[PDB]
Write an enzyme that holds these catalytic residues in place. Structure first.
Site, PDB file in Angstrom:
ATOM      1  N   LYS A  37      -4.699  -6.858  11.284  1.00 16.01           N
ATOM      2  CA  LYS A  37      -4.677  -6.130  12.558  1.00 16.01           C
ATOM      3  C   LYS A  37      -5.336  -6.970  13.652  1.00 16.01           C
ATOM      4  CE  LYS A  37      -2.195  -2.657  11.464  1.00 16.01           C
ATOM      5  NZ  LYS A  37      -2.601  -1.467  10.671  1.00 16.01           N
ATOM      6  N   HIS A  77       1.507   3.840   2.049  1.00 16.63           N
ATOM      7  CA  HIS A  77       2.213   4.460   3.167  1.00 16.63           C
ATOM      8  C   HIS A  77       3.713   4.186   3.097  1.00 16.63           C
ATOM      9  CE1 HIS A  77      -1.697   4.637   5.749  1.00 16.63           C
ATOM     10  NE2 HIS A  77      -1.546   5.715   4.999  1.00 16.63           N
ATOM     11  N   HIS A 126       0.869  -1.171   0.000  1.00 14.63           N
ATOM     12  CA  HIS A 126       0.000   0.000   0.000  1.00 14.63           C
ATOM     13  C   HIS A 126       0.907   1.222   0.000  1.00 14.63           C
ATOM     14  CE1 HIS A 126       1.199   0.209   4.056  1.00 14.63           C
ATOM     15  NE2 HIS A 126       0.198   0.929   4.517  1.00 14.63           N
ATOM     16  N   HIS A 148       2.860  -5.159  11.393  1.00 12.51           N
ATOM     17  CA  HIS A 148       3.184  -4.534  12.667  1.00 12.51           C
ATOM     18  C   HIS A 148       3.039  -5.435  13.891  1.00 12.51           C
ATOM     19  CE1 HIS A 148       3.704  -0.858  10.508  1.00 12.51           C
ATOM     20  NE2 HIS A 148       2.451  -0.842  10.091  1.00 12.51           N
ATOM     21  N   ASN A 171      -4.054   3.259  13.245  1.00  8.45           N
ATOM     22  CA  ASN A 171      -4.437   4.555  12.693  1.00  8.45           C
ATOM     23  C   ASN A 171      -5.524   4.392  11.638  1.00  8.45           C
ATOM     24  OD1 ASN A 171      -4.567   7.195  11.778  1.00  8.45           O
ATOM     25  ND2 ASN A 171      -2.338   7.457  11.729  1.00  8.45           N
ATOM     26  N   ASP A 204       5.821   3.113   5.093  1.00  8.89           N
ATOM     27  CA  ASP A 204       6.421   1.889   5.625  1.00  8.89           C
ATOM     28  C   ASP A 204       6.404   0.748   4.617  1.00  8.89           C
ATOM     29  OD1 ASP A 204       3.622   1.522   5.866  1.00  8.89           O
ATOM     30  OD2 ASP A 204       3.807   0.421   7.762  1.00  8.89           O
ATOM     31  N   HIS A 236      -7.457  -0.991   5.780  1.00 12.36           N
ATOM     32  CA  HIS A 236      -6.503  -0.075   6.397  1.00 12.36           C
ATOM     33  C   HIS A 236      -6.288   1.170   5.537  1.00 12.36           C
ATOM     34  CE1 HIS A 236      -2.875   1.545   8.156  1.00 12.36           C
ATOM     35  NE2 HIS A 236      -2.232   1.337   7.021  1.00 12.36           N
ATOM     36  N   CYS A 241      -0.340  -4.129   6.271  1.00 12.32           N
ATOM     37  CA  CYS A 241      -0.959  -3.344   7.327  1.00 12.32           C
ATOM     38  C   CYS A 241      -2.459  -3.581   7.412  1.00 12.32           C
ATOM     39  CB  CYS A 241      -0.626  -1.868   7.112  1.00 12.32           C
ATOM     40  SG  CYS A 241       1.159  -1.686   6.872  1.00 12.32           S
TER      41      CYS A 241
HETATM   42  C1  LIG Z   1       5.233   7.241   8.130  1.00 13.59           C
HETATM   43  C2  LIG Z   1       4.869   6.671   9.494  1.00 13.59           C
HETATM   44  O1  LIG Z   1       3.557   6.105   9.439  1.00 13.59           O
HETATM   45  C3  LIG Z   1       3.524   4.861   8.891  1.00 13.59           C
HETATM   46  O2  LIG Z   1       4.363   4.573   8.063  1.00 13.59           O
HETATM   47  C4  LIG Z   1       2.371   3.965   9.396  1.00 13.59           C
HETATM   48  C5  LIG Z   1       1.931   3.205   8.104  1.00 13.59           C
HETATM   49  S1  LIG Z   1       0.751   1.854   8.394  1.00 13.59           S
HETATM   50  N1  LIG Z   1       1.266   4.705  10.061  1.00 13.59           N
HETATM   51  C6  LIG Z   1       0.607   3.805  11.092  1.00 13.59           C
HETATM   52  C7  LIG Z   1      -0.319   4.565  12.114  1.00 13.59           C
HETATM   53  O3  LIG Z   1      -0.275   5.812  12.070  1.00 13.59           O
HETATM   54  O4  LIG Z   1      -0.980   3.837  12.876  1.00 13.59           O
HETATM   55  C8  LIG Z   1       1.641   3.041  11.906  1.00 13.59           C
HETATM   56  C9  LIG Z   1       1.162   1.682  12.450  1.00 13.59           C
HETATM   57  C10 LIG Z   1       2.195   3.847  13.069  1.00 13.59           C
HETATM   58  S2  LIG Z   1       2.961   2.724  10.715  1.00 13.59           S
HETATM   59 ZN   LIG Z   2      -0.350   1.957   6.316  1.00 11.77          ZN
HETATM   60 ZN   LIG Z   3       1.970  -0.011   8.242  1.00 11.21          ZN
END
Ligand SMILES: CCOC(=O)[C@]1(CS)N[C@H](C(=O)O)C(C)(C)S1
Ligand SMILES: [Zn+2]
Ligand SMILES: [Zn+2]
Length: 219
Positions: free
Chosen positions: A159, A77, A75, A195, A165, A79, A137, A156
């Site tokens: 879960k 994001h 996806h 995660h 988030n 990460d 997500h 992601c």
């Molecule tokens: C750039 C930093 O943000 C991220 O790359 C993610 C992508 S899933 N955002 C998530 C969230 O905000 O819950 C997370 C589990 C913390 S990791």
């Molecule tokens: Zn994400």
């Molecule tokens: Zn993630």
């Protein structure tokens, strides 16, 4: 100081790479991806958070004799996509769905050089399959299936203990997308989340339960 990139064998031809980033409001966040070996070629399933760790991950497998044939991002994001820019600068093919690339472009981020469009896509025929369960997500999240190992990288989207988030999430669709994922991969031997720790097919059930509960709590 953040923990260093970890690389750990999960199965024959399958390695889990774990990178770490400080994410404001979440503290230190681990991110799991895969490296999948087919013959002497390596495929990255999601890139680490950063170019630094993407380079370290690539170096490790090249030094061991594996050619990096491409990456796929589950996806948009960072990460999952943080290393695409660096891979592109090295002429290593990068893949993402058409919708993932649209969302990268919209956020002013570098796009993958290759895109695919549709519910199923063979990254490597008979070895590495990409599947879109529907929004959850994020609107674009896809999963990656290794049929010869019965391993599902859920990204992601998986879960098991809480949705995380919801900023980009489609909470009304996640239960349906999760039901579809469970019905297609209910026989997975291993399910790899982004995660949390690797588990069995019950992570599909737990995800569906967390999605249904998340949709209920938004009353
Ligand atoms: C750039 C930093 O943000 C991220 O790359 C993610 C992508 S899933 N955002 C998530 C969230 O905000 O819950 C997370 C589990 C913390 S990791
Ligand atoms: Zn994400
Ligand atoms: Zn993630």
């Amino acid at each position: 100081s953040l923990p260093d990139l970890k690389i750990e064998k999960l199965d024959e031809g399958v390695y889990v790479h774990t990178s770490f980033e400080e994410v404001n409001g979440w503290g230190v966040v681990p991110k799991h991806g895969l490296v999948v070996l087919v013959n002497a070629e390596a495929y990255l399933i999601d890139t680490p958070f950063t170019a630094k760790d993407t380079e370290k991950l690539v170096t490790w497998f090249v030094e061991r004799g594996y050619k990096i044939k491409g990456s796929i991002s589950s996806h948009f994001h960072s990460d999952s996509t943080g290393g695409i820019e660096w891979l592109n600068s090295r002429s290593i093919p990068t893949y993402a769905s058409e919708l993932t690339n649209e969302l990268l472009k919209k956020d002013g981020k570098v796009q993958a050089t290759n895109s695919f469009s549709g519910v199923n896509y063979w990254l490597v025929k008979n070895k590495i399959e990409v599947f879109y369960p529907g929004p959850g997500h994020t609107p674009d999240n896809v999963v990656v299936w290794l049929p010869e190992r019965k391993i599902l990288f859920g990204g992601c989207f998986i879960k098991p203990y809480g949705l995380g988030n919801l900023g980009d999430a489609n909470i009304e669709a996640w239960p349906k997308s999760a039901k579809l994922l469970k019905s297609k991969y209910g026989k997975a031997k291993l399910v790899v989340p982004s995660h949390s720790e690797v588990g069995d097919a019950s992570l599909l059930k737990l995800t569906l339960e967390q999605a249904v509960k998340g949709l209920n709590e938004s009353k």
